[PDB]
Write a protein that binds this ligand. Structure first.
Ligand SMILES: CCCCS(=O)(=O)N[C@H](CO)C(=O)N[C@@H](C)C(=O)NCc1ccc(C(=N)N)cc1
Length: 247
């Protein structure tokens, strides 16, 4: 997250931190995610496409820091890693960038709700916030494009939803952005998500209810003028989500 402010997991209880176990013994951060049900986390496919082995991932809930423990945090293994079969990456656009991770603790249980661990509501069929609406994003991603390290504390910021018409303009992204994607940015181009925030949530207050509206996916650079962040439009993937989370 470029700009914005540091926050705690108490303010983003649905946030999931995903790490990968390494061939030696070290563990590195991969992407963010969101808890949509006690046993399910939703993230982005581009985060796992190159290493589709479920056994190498670890999911933390109730965690506020990157490399240190947080009181009340819970560790989970990945029981099933579901990637979207139609995922593809073009020059800029990442299509169908969405994934599901079924989690389970060593005792074989799912997440237990608490003050620091809660689920986030999914949207209704094709029911998205009006363009110009303020939404929030959270993540452990880069604070500056020139950084090679991630911040130790979780961050969050607020951006505004941009219409498909505006985002489709020549100086923006042209035809690369589709109706299955959502653009959001700071009107001053000062704050934005960046590398490392992938898979994280774009949450919007819809009818007094916090809703998972988008998933951090792609963008040209970070916080660049006329180059908004592009998010996977969750409302267009409800059928895919329902079919893969049943049994
Ligand atoms: C430092 C990031 C540079 C990104 S880039 O090379 O200009 N664009 C590519 C185009 O497909 C890209 O976005 N790749 C994906 C995997 C990616 O890096 N996603 C993370 C990412 C998330 C948000 C944003 C943003 N809001 N601008 C920017 C990047």
């Amino acid at each position: 997250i470029i700009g914005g402010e540091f926050t705690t997991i108490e303010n983003q209880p649905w946030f999931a931190a995903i790490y990968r176990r390494h061939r030696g013994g070290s563990v590195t951060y991969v992407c963010g995610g969101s808890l949509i049900s006690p046993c399910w986390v939703i993230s982005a496919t581009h985060c796992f496409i190159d290493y589709p082995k479920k056994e190498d991932y670890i999911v933390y809930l109730g965690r506020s820091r990157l490399n240190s423990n947080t009181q009340g945090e819970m560790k989970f293994e990945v029981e099933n890693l579901i990637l979207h079969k139609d995922y593809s990456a073009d020059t800029l656009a990442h299509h169908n960038d969405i994934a599901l991770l079924k989690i389970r603790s060593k005792e074989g249980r799912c997440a237990q709700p608490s003050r620091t661990i809660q689920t986030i509501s999914l949207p209704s069929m094709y029911n998205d916030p009006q363009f110009g609406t303020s939404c929030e994003i959270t993540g452990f991603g880069k604070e500056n494009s020139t950084d090679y390290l991630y911040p130790e504390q979780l961050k969050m910021t607020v951006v505004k939803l941009i219409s498909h018409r505006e985002c489709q303009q020549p100086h923006y992204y042209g035809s690369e952005v589709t109706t299955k994607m959502l653009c959001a940015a700071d009107p001053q181009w000062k704050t934005d998500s960046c590398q490392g925030d992938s898979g994280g949530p774009l949450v919007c207050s819809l009818q007094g209810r916090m809703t998972l509206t988008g998933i951090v996916s792609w963008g040209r650079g970070c916080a660049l003028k006329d180059k908004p962040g592009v998010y996977t439009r969750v409302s267009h993937f409800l059928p895919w989500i329902r079919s893969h989370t049943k049994e």
